[PDB]
């Protein structure tokens, strides 16, 4: 006996409905009609979501559809107008197949679990870009995305592609939709060294993107643009820059080819399905059924695995999300302000059409790609000094003890002078600054420095991250850290460390004028009467907390802590506190500076000071390489000789 197995669909026009029924009949004719038969039902798009959902429950599901096909309407209303069906069929787990919805938001199985499509989403376009990036060998790019499930998905996909490689987030830039002026964000973009750009946005947004981009002349040569199908199309095409690279999916406009093929796949899936037993028909009508349809997920499983590589649309296989795989796109170029096919992309490999490559601005062939360092510091007296620039005028001609003029640079940092704390423009001059500029003459880089808002260098706290300049480094507020930073393993895992410019260890300052060891019985014999003082969140405190062996001794130090270096030296000078503990490099210079106060014992926690960088940044490789080169010639020795005065002091006893 025959059994009539219904299928259902929502399509743009009655002609396409006839096309649907025709394809279905082709499926019936060409597969056993004795065992099973396929029947076709369809409806035009309705003006609202609701009429259509009601149509599915009433007009379609009453026919017991085993699956539904859906296409984008003639006039797109908002976006993802085939949103309701995926939900509606989804309740009963009836598989849905979209023809025209390239929308990415359907890729998450969680929200739409019945959704499959004969087209890949806009996110999957990144497959091309990685391959494109692969060929041209630009590892450094910039990504501009709108803020929504679409853009963020694109970012996730591309980044996931990059994850197999060393993860590459050269930079990423998020803007929110509907925003006419984007200028500031691109101003941020130019600073990034990488000269290749890729973007995903809506047509209207893209107009604003190109409009803003042209103002800053980022459309020029030495810059590259890679984009989505939507970006090249519409009003965006009108305002689009020359030489841009662009994508168009094949048969994206046509529902019908996708119809014939989708139905073909459905037929193959069903005929493969009925080979299995314990099947159940879908629920008859929406009314009276609160229960899902147990077969539906299985139908989805076979249908996702359903092969039939030969199709009108191209190869057919489905990814985990139910999204299509191995789809083909045609690359497009803007030559003479018109769209041309430079090449076509099919399968996992790009194909180059005979047409000449165009890049933006004039290039016969120009694959060109790939400038600033944000530096952060802290207020530490020996290696850094802070004075404000006098009025508008910049820096003093003040001279070192050896006759040389003192060099200086501008730094934006926390000011306690005002009652509120503004990030204040300031002048800073230092050993680390001279070193930095020494590098800057040696290194291709240019430098802009601002002091970190927090007086602390950094410490883990609060989830969140370690407060202080280090935190800025991971955050990227500053890409490189130049300061007197001790180098330790706890920090070391998080970031790369430059070879030490300086070698120093902790020690104690006490006034001379009338502490046996790092282990002082006097420390070991603490007293409320005899204070020993430090800074909370100073790395020394990390030594106290991390180390188990002295863990008891930490607490006595914890009492009566000071906030900053100046206050800590002052307490001993003021004689408020009998002893002060800090690393030598900051301390010895002061020991020379007063001589009223003295350093004692042997540097313990022997360590070094180095310049912080992310492990991912290769510039540090040169930095250490440079640091060593600066050590061998005695550059450091002369710099310490300049900045450590040594003028008046001696061993007192």
């Amino acid at each position: 006996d025959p059994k009539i197995v219904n299928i259902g669909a929502v399509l743009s026009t009655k002609k396409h409905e006839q096309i649907f029924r025709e394809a279905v009949n082709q499926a019936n004719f060409f597969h056993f009609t004795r065992k099973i038969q396929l029947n076709a039902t369809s409806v035009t798009h309705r003006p609202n979501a609701i009429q259509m959902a009601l149509s599915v429950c009433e007009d379609l599901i009453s026919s017991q559809v085993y699956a539904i096909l859906v296409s984008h309407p003639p006039a797109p209303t908002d976006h993802l107008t085939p949103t309701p069906i995926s939900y509606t069929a989804g309740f009963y787990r009836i598989p849905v197949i979209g023809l025209t919805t390239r929308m990415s938001i359907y890729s998450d199985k969680s929200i739409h679990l019945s959704f499959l499509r004969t087209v890949p989403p806009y996110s999957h376009q990144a497959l091309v870009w990685f391959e494109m990036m692969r060929l041209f060998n630009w590892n450094h790019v910039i990504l501009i995305v709108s803020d929504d499930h679409e853009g963020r998905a694109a970012q996730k996909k591309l980044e996931t592609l990059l994850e197999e490689k060393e993860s590459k987030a050269d930079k990423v830039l998020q803007f929110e939709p509907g925003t006419k002026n984007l200028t500031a964000l691109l101003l941020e973009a130019k600073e990034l060294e990488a000269r290749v750009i890729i973007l995903s946005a809506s047509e209207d947004d893209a107009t604003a993107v190109y409009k803003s981009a042209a103002m800053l002349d980022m459309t020029g040569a030495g810059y590259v643009w890679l984009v989505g199908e939507r970006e090249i199309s519409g009003s965006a095409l009108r305002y689009a820059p020359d030489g841009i690279i662009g994508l168009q999916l094949i048969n994206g406009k046509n529902e019908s080819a996708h119809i014939s093929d989708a139905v073909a796949v459905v037929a193959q899936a069903i005929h493969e399905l009925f080979e299995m037993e314990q099947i159940t028909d879908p629920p008859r009508g929406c009314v009276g059924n609160t229960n899902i349809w147990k077969t539906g997920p299985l139908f989805k499983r076979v249908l996702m695995s359903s092969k039939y590589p030969d199709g009108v649309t191209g190869r057919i296989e489905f990814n985990e999300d139910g999204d299509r795989k191995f789809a083909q796109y045609s690359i497009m170029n803007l030559q003479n302000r018109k769209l041309v096919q430079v090449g076509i992309f099919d399968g996992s490999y790009i194909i180059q059409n005979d047409r000449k490559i165009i890049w933006p601005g004039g290039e016969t062939e120009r694959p060109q790609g790939y400038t600033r360092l944000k530096i952060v510091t802290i207020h530490q007296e020996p290696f850094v000094y802070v004075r404000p620039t006098t009025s508008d005028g910049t820096c003093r001609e003040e001279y070192t003890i050896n006759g040389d003029p003192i060099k200086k640079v501008i730094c934006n940092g926390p000011d306690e002078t005002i009652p509120g704390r503004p990030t204040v423009p300031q002048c800073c001059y230092g050993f680390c600054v001279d070193l930095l500029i020494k590098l800057a003459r040696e290194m291709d880089f240019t430098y802009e420095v601002h002091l970190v808002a927090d007086g602390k260098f950094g410490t883990q706290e609060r989830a969140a991250a370690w407060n202080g300049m280090m935190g800025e480094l991971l955050s990227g507020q500053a890409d490189m850290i130049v300061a007197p930073l001790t180098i330790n393993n706890e920090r070391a895992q998080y970031i790369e460390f430059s070879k030490p410019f300086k070698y120093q260890g902790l020690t104690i300052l006490v006034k001379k004028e009338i502490i046996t060891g790092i282990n002082d019985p006097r420390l070991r014999n603490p007293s409320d009467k005899f204070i020993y003082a430090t800074v909370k969140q100073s790395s020394v405190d990390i030594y106290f907390r991390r180390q188990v062996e002295l863990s008891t001794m930490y607490r006595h130090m914890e009492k009566h802590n000071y906030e900053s270096a100046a206050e800590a030296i002052q307490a001993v000078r003021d004689n408020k506190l009998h002893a002060f503990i800090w690393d030598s490099a900051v301390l010895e210079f002061e020991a020379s500076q007063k001589c009223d106060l003295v350093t004692t014992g042997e540097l313990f926690f022997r360590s070094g000071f180095g310049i912080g960088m992310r492990k991912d940044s290769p510039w540090k490789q040169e930095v250490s390489l440079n640091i060593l080169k600066s050590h061998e010639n005695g550059f450091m020795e002369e710099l310490d000789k300049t900045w450590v005065r040594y003028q008046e002091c001696d061993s007192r006893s």
């Binding site: 959902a53 969680s110 679990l113 997920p297 282990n519 019985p521």
Partner: protein, 633 residues
């Protein structure tokens, strides 16, 4: 002038045809500026078509400005459906019970939908409080692709990172219910996890399948326990016994407040939001309800309503919502599956804080396992071996038995007492014996010797004694924190390089130490000449080394600082003293061996400084360590 709002409410289920009609809506709190106009309707079983049709049907020209939904059903999906209508209408809708109260995907921001179920994040927090209460530290999560995953995984991650405790997340599993399995792929994964406490997250229906599969896997039994969010328990009226017993989950209580009281809460929220919005703009909230046509004008203006509606208070009770649309902190009850089919309450939880009833053993030592044999050696101020009274036949008082393979010897002393207190505090039992080969560990060529050998051979778990600490032994075995200040030191009657060479001084000088010591090894490592010279002055034993010092024929003696200080205090005559202040180089302390990174470890360390924390060590120092000499002080 008279501002009468238009409102509608629906009840589904109720286990009655002729479900209780219009029980409420009786004027309460009439003072509120807008008076409610109510139309009530009920429908028996839920459908997307039935619900959509009916709600739009009630919309008609009626122009209702608000809707409350309630159900007898366990269904997850319903909330989303009504939410969809809300997205379309921009007409507020909320629900007080069952599925609508059950969690849903993150709501569209433009959309207005609210649920009287708890937040996913909140629920995860409560699950964590429950685990913390029973101090179940180690756990895993089984989840499904249903919405809220990774809002849940993230929430657990956030809640977990902050806490001090060393809890372990073992595994997180994501399995698609779609692409339903021949593979029993869920069985294949679930079989892997070894963790005692499992959090599960899924649809009500899915929990059944996962549980049947767990029953096949053997995961429901014997020591493993499962903890569940609101969704699985749902109504709690109907419970397939596919769910294992002892299953722990949170839900809203029917008993505290009945469903009509809850509906009253909903109506109150809608009319309070209307009153506040009125107070702000003096404007009628009323809007055309009909879905079929385009949304009524100035309904687009409605956004502020949501902004007003998020937190609402009446009857001294807060309805405050969260951005997602769940109420910020509804009262919640900790529930368990009592034996048979019972859902019987265990805990109450509200706002910040949680309270639970049962004390212990809710629903071969559970806290910890195995046994530890210990090896030691006899020292003259760390451990003392004594011969037990033969008539007694067994050890007396503080003395604890220790055996030496060659006979039962009786050990007592500092190590015995410290060990005894530690054993009392951590509450474990132990076997003590004496080392044979090489005493404290000694290296000849390639191989180790001594107690360390028995620690490496696993013939000993922990080694105790006067054993000093060094980098090599810390490398091979984890050491306890030092209990006492000690180290290398000198003892004589009464860095200069006088030690470095004897030959510089014309008369021959003399100093020696006990061989196979950490002192001798350290010496050989840093100072060769001293070792090569001192080998002649090496002595058999501390009593004999003392014989070389005491009777003459040797000038200076060098040894452990604690022993030399105790010996300084204890001497037949005060003929012997320490060097300088006895301030020792190589500042060290006595540690205790463990195997490697795997050990009771930190638990020991805590115990140790608790010993000083109560000040016992000072007493023990006065009793055992304190010598009579150093009397003129």
């Amino acid at each position: 002038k008279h501002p009468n709002m238009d409102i509608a409410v629906i009840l589904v289920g109720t286990t009655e045809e002729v479900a209780i009609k219009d029980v409420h809506e009786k004027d309460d709190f009439h003072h509120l500026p807008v008076t409610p106009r109510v139309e009530l309707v009920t429908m028996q079983e839920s459908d997307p078509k039935s619900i959509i049709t009916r709600i739009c049907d009630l919309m008609s020209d009626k122009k209702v400005q608000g809707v409350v939904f309630g159900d007898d059903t366990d269904q997850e999906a319903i909330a989303q459906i009504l939410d969809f209508i809300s997205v379309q209408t921009l007409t507020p809708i909320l629900g007080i019970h069952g599925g609508s109260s059950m969690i849903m995907a993150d709501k569209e921001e433009a959309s207005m939908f609210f649920q009287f179920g708890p937040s996913i994040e909140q629920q995860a927090s409560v699950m964590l409080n429950i685990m913390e209460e029973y101090d179940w530290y180690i756990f895993s999560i089984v989840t499904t692709y249903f919405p809220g995953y990774q809002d849940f995984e993230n929430k657990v991650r956030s809640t977990i990172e902050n806490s001090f405790v060393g809890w372990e997340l073992e595994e997180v599993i994501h399995l698609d219910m779609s692409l339903d399995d021949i593979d029993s792929k869920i069985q294949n994964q679930l079989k892997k996890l070894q963790s005692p406490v499992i959090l599960l997250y899924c649809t009500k229906e899915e929990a059944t399948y996962i549980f049947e599969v767990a029953h096949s896997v053997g995961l429901t039994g014997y020591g493993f326990t499962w903890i569940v969010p609101s969704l699985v328990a749902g109504d709690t009226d109907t419970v397939p016994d596919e769910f294992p017993t002892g299953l722990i989950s949170v839900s809203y209580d029917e008993w505290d407040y009945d469903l009509p009281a809850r509906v009253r809460d909903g109506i109150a929220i809608i009319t309070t939001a209307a009153s506040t919005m009125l107070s702000e703009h003096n404007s009628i909230p009323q809007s055309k309800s009909s879905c079929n046509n385009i949304q009524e004008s100035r309904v687009y203006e409605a956004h502020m309503l949501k902004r007003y509606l998020i937190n609402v208070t009446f009857e001294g009770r807060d309805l405050s919502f969260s951005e997602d649309g769940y109420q910020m902190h509804p009262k919640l009850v900790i529930i368990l599956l009592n034996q048979e089919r019972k859902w019987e309450r265990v805990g109450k939880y509200k706002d910040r804080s949680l309270k639970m009833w049962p004390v212990f053993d809710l629903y071969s030592e559970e806290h910890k396992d195995e046994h530890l044999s210990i090896v030691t050696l006899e020292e003259a101020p760390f451990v003392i071996v004594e011969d037990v009274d033969p008539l007694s036949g067994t050890c007396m008082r503080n003395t604890v038995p220790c055996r030496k393979q060659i006979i039962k010897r009786c050990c007592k002393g500092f190590c015995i007492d410290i060990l005894k207190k530690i054993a009392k505090t951590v509450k474990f039992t132990y076997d003590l014996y004496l080392v044979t080969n090489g005493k404290h560990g000694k290296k000849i060529n390639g191989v180790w010797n001594g107690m360390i050998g028995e620690v490496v051979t696993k013939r000993a778990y922990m080694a105790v004694g006067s054993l000093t600490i060094n980098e090599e032994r810390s490398e091979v075995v984890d050491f306890s924190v030092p209990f006492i200040e000690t180290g290398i030191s000198v003892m004589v009657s009464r860095s200069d390089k006088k030690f470095q060479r004897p030959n510089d001084f014309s008369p021959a000088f003399r100093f020696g130490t006990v061989p196979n010591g950490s002192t001798e090894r350290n010496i050989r490592n840093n100072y060769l000449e001293m070792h090569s010279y001192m080998v002649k002055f090496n002595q058999r034993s501390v009593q004999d080394a003392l014989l070389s010092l005491k009777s003459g024929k040797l000038d200076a003696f060098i040894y452990d600082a604690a022993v030399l200080n105790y010996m300084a205090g204890r001497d037949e005559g005060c003929k012997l003293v320490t060097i300088g202040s006895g301030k020792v180089f190589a500042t060290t302390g006595y540690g205790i061996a463990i195997q490697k990174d795997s050990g009771w470890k930190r638990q020991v360390d805590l115990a140790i400084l608790q010993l000083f924390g109560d000040g016992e060590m000072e007493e023990l120092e006065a009793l055992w360590l304190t010598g009579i000499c150093h009397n003129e002080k």
